[PDB]
Paper text:
Thioadduct formation entails a hybridization change of the flavin C4a atom from sp2 to sp3 and concomitant protonation of the adjacent N5 atom. A highly conserved glutamine residue in strand Iβ is situated immediately adjacent to the flavin and has been identified as instrumental in reading out the flavin N5 position and eliciting the downstream transitions.
To arrive at a molecular understanding, we solved the crystal structures of AsLOV2 wild-type and Q513L in the dark-adapted states to resolutions of 1.00 Å and 0.90 Å, respectively. The flavin pteridin moiety was coordinated by the asparagines N482 and N492, and the flavin O4 atom hydrogen-bonded to the amide NεH2 group of the conserved Q513. At the present high resolution, an alternate conformation could be resolved for the terminal turn of the Jα helix (residues 543-546), possibly reflecting the inherent equilibrium between folded and unfolded helical states. Crucially, the A’α helix is interlocked with the C-terminal part of Jα via the hydrophobic residues L408, I411, I539, A542, and L546.
Residue numbers in the entry: 401 to 546
The structure:
Amino acid sequence: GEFLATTLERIEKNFVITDPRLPDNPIIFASDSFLQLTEYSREEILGRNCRFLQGPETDRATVRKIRDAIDNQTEVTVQLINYTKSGKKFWNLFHLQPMRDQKGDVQYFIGVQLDGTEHVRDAAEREGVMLIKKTAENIDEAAKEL
Ligand SMILES: Cc1cc2nc3c(=O)[nH]c(=O)nc-3n(C[C@H](O)[C@H](O)[C@H](O)COP(=O)(O)O)c2cc1C
Ligand SMILES: [Ca+2]
Ligand SMILES: [Cl-]
């Protein structure tokens, strides 16, 4: 199909990279795993803001937490219900953080999704946050020279 995955998009994790310089802070990179999770083709989602993942049972207070982190240029970790292209629900243990350049300016945002079947707590929450934060750090390394 269109937009063959780059090497970075073949990293075996669900993530996207957005460019806040572009209209509506849209996706510019999306991993193959993210596409498999969400059922979209890459062409379908490039240039779009990630809010298409939200639907009727998505808690809007949790979306506001993400909105506020983006506008304060700071990280956040939350859990919220998201939807695939066909309307299948999944829980998303979600981590966002900015990627800074060598002047400390925000160049991209990185978002990492750990899909699950339930809201998690305790050990499953801790292990999931470990995984998505480590992944975000790895994508920070991977995306620094893009
Ligand atoms: C890098 C990045 C990744 C995002 N990933 C998700 C996601 O997995 N799920 C989601 O519901 N929102 C995600 N968002 C949040 C939305 O794109 C958007 O910021 C949120 O809906 C608040 O803005 P709005 O009020 O204009 O919709 C992501 C945002 C960014 C910048
Ligand atoms: Ca799942
Ligand atoms: Cl749990």
